[PDB]
Design a protein around this motif. Structure first.
Motif, PDB file in Angstrom:
ATOM      1  N   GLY A 144      -4.015   3.989   1.682  1.00 58.73           N
ATOM      2  CA  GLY A 144      -2.926   4.620   0.970  1.00 58.73           C
ATOM      3  C   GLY A 144      -2.101   5.502   1.887  1.00 58.73           C
ATOM      4  N   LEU A 145      -1.070   4.970   2.535  1.00 60.48           N
ATOM      5  CA  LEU A 145      -0.233   5.801   3.402  1.00 60.48           C
ATOM      6  C   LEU A 145       0.719   6.638   2.575  1.00 60.48           C
ATOM      7  CD1 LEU A 145       1.317   4.488   6.732  1.00 60.48           C
ATOM      8  CD2 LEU A 145      -0.248   6.361   6.310  1.00 60.48           C
ATOM      9  N   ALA A 153       3.694  -0.117  -1.925  1.00 58.78           N
ATOM     10  CA  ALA A 153       3.401  -1.115  -2.949  1.00 58.78           C
ATOM     11  C   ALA A 153       3.664  -2.531  -2.430  1.00 58.78           C
ATOM     12  CB  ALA A 153       4.232  -0.845  -4.196  1.00 58.78           C
ATOM     13  N   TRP A 156       1.252  -3.886   0.287  1.00 62.71           N
ATOM     14  CA  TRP A 156      -0.082  -4.144  -0.277  1.00 62.71           C
ATOM     15  C   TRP A 156      -0.059  -5.429  -1.088  1.00 62.71           C
ATOM     16  CZ3 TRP A 156      -5.097  -2.270  -1.127  1.00 62.71           C
ATOM     17  CH2 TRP A 156      -5.438  -1.048  -0.513  1.00 62.71           C
ATOM     18  N   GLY A 157       1.108  -5.730  -1.662  1.00 63.75           N
ATOM     19  CA  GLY A 157       1.326  -6.944  -2.432  1.00 63.75           C
ATOM     20  C   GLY A 157       1.475  -8.097  -1.465  1.00 63.75           C
ATOM     21  N   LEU A 164      -4.396 -15.178  -1.984  1.00 58.68           N
ATOM     22  CA  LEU A 164      -4.425 -16.172  -3.063  1.00 58.68           C
ATOM     23  C   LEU A 164      -3.780 -17.459  -2.558  1.00 58.68           C
ATOM     24  CD1 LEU A 164      -1.738 -17.072  -5.084  1.00 58.68           C
ATOM     25  CD2 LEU A 164      -1.615 -14.597  -5.187  1.00 58.68           C
TER      26      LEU A 164
ATOM     27  N   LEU C 111       4.376  -3.852 -11.514  1.00 60.88           N
ATOM     28  CA  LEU C 111       4.440  -2.820 -10.462  1.00 60.88           C
ATOM     29  C   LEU C 111       5.392  -1.692 -10.801  1.00 60.88           C
ATOM     30  CD1 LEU C 111       3.357  -1.876  -7.632  1.00 60.88           C
ATOM     31  CD2 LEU C 111       4.839  -3.578  -6.623  1.00 60.88           C
ATOM     32  N   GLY C 152      -1.073 -11.528  -9.204  1.00 60.97           N
ATOM     33  CA  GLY C 152      -1.977 -11.208  -8.115  1.00 60.97           C
ATOM     34  C   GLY C 152      -1.237 -10.233  -7.225  1.00 60.97           C
ATOM     35  N   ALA C 153       0.010 -10.603  -6.902  1.00 62.45           N
ATOM     36  CA  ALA C 153       0.951  -9.823  -6.093  1.00 62.45           C
ATOM     37  C   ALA C 153       1.249  -8.407  -6.614  1.00 62.45           C
ATOM     38  CB  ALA C 153       2.261 -10.615  -5.919  1.00 62.45           C
ATOM     39  N   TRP C 156      -2.103  -6.269  -6.630  1.00 64.83           N
ATOM     40  CA  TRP C 156      -2.487  -5.675  -5.361  1.00 64.83           C
ATOM     41  C   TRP C 156      -1.583  -4.490  -5.120  1.00 64.83           C
ATOM     42  CZ3 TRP C 156      -5.737  -6.670  -1.014  1.00 64.83           C
ATOM     43  CH2 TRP C 156      -6.652  -7.707  -1.198  1.00 64.83           C
ATOM     44  N   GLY C 157      -0.319  -4.626  -5.522  1.00 67.37           N
ATOM     45  CA  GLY C 157       0.655  -3.561  -5.388  1.00 67.37           C
ATOM     46  C   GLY C 157       0.280  -2.288  -6.144  1.00 67.37           C
ATOM     47  N   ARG C 159      -2.617  -1.345  -6.735  1.00 66.09           N
ATOM     48  CA  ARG C 159      -3.781  -0.816  -6.058  1.00 66.09           C
ATOM     49  C   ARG C 159      -3.303   0.079  -4.910  1.00 66.09           C
ATOM     50  NH1 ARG C 159      -8.980  -2.676  -2.826  1.00 66.09           N
ATOM     51  NH2 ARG C 159      -7.785  -4.429  -2.021  1.00 66.09           N
ATOM     52  N   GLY C 160      -2.480  -0.470  -4.021  1.00 62.98           N
ATOM     53  CA  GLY C 160      -1.987   0.298  -2.891  1.00 62.98           C
ATOM     54  C   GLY C 160      -1.141   1.494  -3.246  1.00 62.98           C
ATOM     55  N   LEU C 161      -0.549   1.460  -4.423  1.00 62.73           N
ATOM     56  CA  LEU C 161       0.293   2.541  -4.880  1.00 62.73           C
ATOM     57  C   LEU C 161      -0.527   3.692  -5.388  1.00 62.73           C
ATOM     58  CD1 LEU C 161       3.280   3.125  -5.193  1.00 62.73           C
ATOM     59  CD2 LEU C 161       3.019   2.615  -7.638  1.00 62.73           C
ATOM     60  N   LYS C 163      -3.521   4.654  -4.355  1.00 63.71           N
ATOM     61  CA  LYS C 163      -3.999   5.341  -3.173  1.00 63.71           C
ATOM     62  C   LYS C 163      -2.957   6.201  -2.480  1.00 63.71           C
ATOM     63  CE  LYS C 163      -7.378   1.678  -2.222  1.00 63.71           C
ATOM     64  NZ  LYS C 163      -8.057   2.475  -3.283  1.00 63.71           N
ATOM     65  N   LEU C 164      -1.757   5.675  -2.265  1.00 64.04           N
ATOM     66  CA  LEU C 164      -0.770   6.493  -1.582  1.00 64.04           C
ATOM     67  C   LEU C 164      -0.366   7.627  -2.483  1.00 64.04           C
ATOM     68  CD1 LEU C 164       2.715   6.123  -2.049  1.00 64.04           C
ATOM     69  CD2 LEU C 164       1.962   3.761  -1.516  1.00 64.04           C
ATOM     70  N   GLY C 232      -7.967   8.382  -5.377  1.00 61.72           N
ATOM     71  CA  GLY C 232      -7.740   7.262  -4.485  1.00 61.72           C
ATOM     72  C   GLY C 232      -8.884   6.283  -4.592  1.00 61.72           C
ATOM     73  N   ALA C 233      -9.605   6.353  -5.703  1.00 59.06           N
ATOM     74  CA  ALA C 233     -10.749   5.467  -5.883  1.00 59.06           C
ATOM     75  C   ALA C 233     -10.369   4.187  -6.631  1.00 59.06           C
ATOM     76  CB  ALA C 233     -11.889   6.216  -6.601  1.00 59.06           C
ATOM     77  N   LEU C 235     -12.378   1.404  -9.210  1.00 51.64           N
ATOM     78  CA  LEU C 235     -13.575   0.939  -9.875  1.00 51.64           C
ATOM     79  C   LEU C 235     -13.519  -0.452 -10.483  1.00 51.64           C
ATOM     80  CD1 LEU C 235     -16.486   1.805 -10.349  1.00 51.64           C
ATOM     81  CD2 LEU C 235     -15.700   2.874 -12.500  1.00 51.64           C
TER      82      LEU C 235
ATOM     83  N   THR D 243      -9.286   7.440   0.551  1.00 48.17           N
ATOM     84  CA  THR D 243      -8.056   6.701   0.220  1.00 48.17           C
ATOM     85  C   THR D 243      -7.159   6.565   1.425  1.00 48.17           C
ATOM     86  OG1 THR D 243      -6.147   8.029  -0.447  1.00 48.17           O
ATOM     87  CG2 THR D 243      -8.150   8.277  -1.643  1.00 48.17           C
TER      88      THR D 243
END
Ligand SMILES: CC1(C)[C@@H](OC(=O)CCC(=O)O)CC[C@]2(C)[C@H]3C(=O)C=C4[C@@H]5C[C@@](C)(C(=O)O)CC[C@]5(C)CC[C@@]4(C)[C@]3(C)CC[C@@H]12
Ligand SMILES: CC1(C)[C@@H](OC(=O)CCC(=O)O)CC[C@]2(C)[C@H]3C(=O)C=C4[C@@H]5C[C@@](C)(C(=O)O)CC[C@]5(C)CC[C@@]4(C)[C@]3(C)CC[C@@H]12
Ligand SMILES: CC1(C)[C@@H](OC(=O)CCC(=O)O)CC[C@]2(C)[C@H]3C(=O)C=C4[C@@H]5C[C@@](C)(C(=O)O)CC[C@]5(C)CC[C@@]4(C)[C@]3(C)CC[C@@H]12
Ligand SMILES: CC1(C)[C@@H](OC(=O)CCC(=O)O)CC[C@]2(C)[C@H]3C(=O)C=C4[C@@H]5C[C@@](C)(C(=O)O)CC[C@]5(C)CC[C@@]4(C)[C@]3(C)CC[C@@H]12
Lengths: 253, 253, 253, 253
Positions: A144-145, A153, A156-157, A164, C111, C152-153, C156-157, C159-161, C163-164, C232-233, C235, D243
């Motif tokens: 997470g930057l 976002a 990461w996408g 996939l 997203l 899927g795209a 994942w987005g 997820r990364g969002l 965390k940041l 930033g977890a 589960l 994170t």
């Protein structure tokens, strides 16, 4: 050896990292179709590489632009074996302060430009017999930057879309992998006051910022058949940036 | 391409993936020390690699042994720039089934034995000014592979030791990365029932198993200076086994 | 246990797991604000959950629809403490099949939709003394899942969002985490051929699918103060689905 | 929800995380069995929780010790429902520095230790028709943590043993999950000069060190039937340590 007697379309190939990537690949004996929305330079760049280059205009967010370039490359060199979704744009700012429009714009180019890039080139590849799609993601697309909002976002996408896709295309001998460079020295980042040169960047274990020759050797490597068994993988090129906090940070200061 | 015009000790290098990276790297221009426990085989193998290959008996869990091979390398050759940690032994049984004694032995050869290699060789690399440690982990180290018990834990330990060492050695030009092959075709695996060829292994996206030549190329690439910025990274060479489920699976068999 | 005698708005709140999360958040004393686009069914539910809930129309892609829902709650229960971004639409098709228009459509809802919620609801949580953002994602954001393309795209987005946003928001007492539910038996999923019960879903180590009640508990735990140190977890709540292949798959059937 | 009515054996329960999770577990109706090498402190701690607690002297590296305590648990209490593998010592020294004796020793308590723990209890749990094994790993198991040598290589190994087991045992109703604490305020970590409190740790997004009640709660939640679908997972209670880097670190400073 990581040689190439094939043809490849590298996006965002006029300046920056795409320029270097292309430089090395042609060096690798491949023919290249640079693609950008910044003509002046794409023109020059291909004009520098030689008889193994050809610059096309390409607005990565447009499937028309996309289909046009694919055909042209099939038309000119006779095949499309590799792709390098390298075009995109940065977002450095505190999320709460980002506009829903800019957000929609970064994801669009960064994320969709990539997808529109892939589903277009897939047929030209089922045609060749196979292909290598190297999506240039980022260190930001691995942790997470903070301060990268829309950029975060998207990147990461791109990381998940490449996985996939890797799963679906496997039997077609069509590999899809992501590369994730960390703080790399270029004129965009130059406006960020990044101290280039050894030991000039203390928040990376290597202590220094990477140069593009470094990140490009990675792309090419994957582009080749050297890596005929690599698919749906991620290769960070950040001098340890992503591995874990450096010593100093762990010591508490 | 990748040039390894330097010095490299290869653990477990007398047969399989070890011998493969042996011969391939020599081709790449390196000077190789085949450290292994099979004297007869390592002898033959080195014999055929020319004055670029040497054989030296090595028990990865014995530190005396290590200081010998490391000292001989530096004496005989001039230095040590790379170490490929390829030695270990597999596990194929349900955890509750494994004797604690087997468990320790395997984790000893696989994890502790690479620790000695790293702890030992370090001073030889700081000398020459830097180098690359390539820890041969597994697909069993990137996701939880059932039936691998001690080998699973072992190999995950390597993915982790690999990372921490890279954040530590970052600024001494010492590079460390993990290499994670999936079902490769080796004598140990031929016995299993594995068969090479297009469509011979459904349960992996590319539909088949890799050969050692495809794994070695991932290796030479990391040893070579071409990756001069790839540290604390993990590359999978498994045709996607590790990236996500297979199409058939995502739906139902 | 996990107590939440606080107020939270639930996106996609009228049905399925967005409805189950509400059913649970309420049981634990939450002042729940259901916000979906099915005005008719979302009124039945908030009606069912009693005087602890309200219903608001929220088109996740519209910045004002967002500001009004927050403003309604704000001027209704006192503050905004928790937020579950549950609204989204799925994707079941190979990438080559998805049109770039559906691609943009889904990503916009999945997203950006959650992004608009993050920056909109933020100032509400600052003035509340902090709080928690729970972004629903899925196994699709945890590995490369075939046949999900845009879903899927975007997954994942998100997820990364998370965390940041986590590292940026920590100091104002705002925790950002993403839940990652696997194949769960909701409305849309029963149409596929998904049968609830033990033995019914062999391709997940648990051999079964999840009822929404099991996914809800994670939402709540992360919404309660019991997780005050979690940020930033991510589960996973899929019965082992993204941990590794089934033993049967590992052996090749 | 977070209410136990089952019997759980916690290891390293004489002092620290084991002690806290013990209180809370007992507080949620769990009949707990504390296991430790500190025959004096645990008997004290046990007297505190009342007639629902019980201390036993166990050495994790001794399988005989294991088979004994597990027998005792099912003797005083009749069944074995959970297990919390909290035993293990730390490391805080550079790789090259640490001995091969100490390494083999930290590995054997931290890793082999959980292995025998898992291997001895599994039956007691199948007898019981299901169980929840919570292995206590560390933020050092999630990233390459500097100066954590052998402690890292085992924490990473516990994370992998947890996942492959979760899959081998899923249809058996036995969940295996690892928990990952970051800089948590315990005595020695305090005796590390760790100033407890809000704002006292700038190098973690949350700006502070966690408390044990905070890691206890997540263990409690994963131990209940309130996460019946959670198997193969990994939860991190680290205030955002894992994170990603501090905004300050991203800016450098
Ligand atoms: C991964 C790389 C190295 C980059 O990397 C590539 O190599 C690009 C190739 C590609 O795009 O494909 C693309 C963008 C980027 C993600 C980048 C960015 O977005 C904007 C900023 C901002 C500049 C600054 C000073 C400010 O706000 O003024 C301070 C805040 C902030 C957020 C941190 C520093 C950078 C420079 C930041 C996050 C460092 C990491 C960086
Ligand atoms: C990690 C890889 C993929 C392989 O990895 C490589 O090739 C690269 C790295 C390396 O070489 O170490 C080395 C062998 C191996 C550890 C492998 C093994 O040993 C034995 C068996 C058994 C074979 C057999 C026939 C039986 O024994 O009954 C059937 C049952 C059983 C349990 C099925 C699972 C496998 C096939 C098992 C555990 C799967 C994972 C596998
Ligand atoms: C992410 C989860 C697990 C699911 O996730 C959840 O249940 C929890 C999270 C959430 O609810 O978002 C939400 C829906 C879903 C995205 C799902 C979907 O959409 C439709 C299909 C199709 C059904 C069918 C019959 C067809 O349509 O042809 C056959 C072909 C096809 C392509 C096979 C696979 C699935 C089942 C597919 C893509 C697998 C992944 C799946
Ligand atoms: C994993 C956690 C976070 C910890 O975790 C917990 O708090 C409990 C939860 C858990 O089980 O993880 C257990 C201790 C430990 C692994 C820890 C340790 O061993 C000793 C030191 C030393 C302290 C100091 C000042 C010195 O004294 O020299 C300076 C150098 C040095 C080496 C670096 C910083 C720490 C503090 C170090 C490596 C940071 C990471 C740390």
């Amino acid at each position: 050896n990581d040689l190439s007697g094939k043809t490849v379309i590298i996006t965002g190939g006029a300046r920056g990292l795409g320029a270097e990537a292309a430089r090395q690949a042609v060096a690798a004996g491949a023919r290249v179709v640079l693609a950008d929305v910044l003509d002046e330079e794409g023109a020059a760049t291909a004009r520098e590489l030689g008889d193994a280059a050809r610059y096309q205009h390409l607005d990565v967010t447009i499937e028309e632009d996309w289909q046009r370039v694919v055909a042209y490359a099939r038309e000119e060199f006779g095949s499309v074996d590799g792709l390098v979704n390298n075009a995109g744009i940065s977002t450095g700012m505190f999320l709460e302060t980002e506009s829903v429009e800019r957000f929609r714009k970064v994801v669009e180019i960064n994320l969709t430009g990539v997808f529109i890039g892939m589903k277009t080139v897939i047929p030209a590849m089922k045609d060749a017999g196979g292909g290598s799609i190297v999506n240039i993601s980022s260190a930001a697309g691995l942790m997470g930057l903070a301060l990268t909002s829309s950029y975060g976002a998207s990147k990461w996408g791109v990381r998940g879309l490449s996985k996939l896709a890797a799963v679906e295309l496997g039997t077609d001998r069509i590999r899809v992998n992501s590369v994730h460079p960390g703080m790399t020295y270029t004129p965009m980042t130059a406006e960020t006051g990044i101290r280039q040169g050894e030991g000039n960047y203390p928040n990376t274990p290597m202590g220094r910022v990477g140069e593009p020759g470094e990140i490009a050797g990675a792309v090419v490597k994957l582009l080749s058949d050297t890596s005929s068994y690599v698919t749906g993988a991620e290769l960070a090129v950040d001098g340890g940036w992503t591995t874990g906090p450096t010593v100093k940070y762990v010591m508490g200061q």
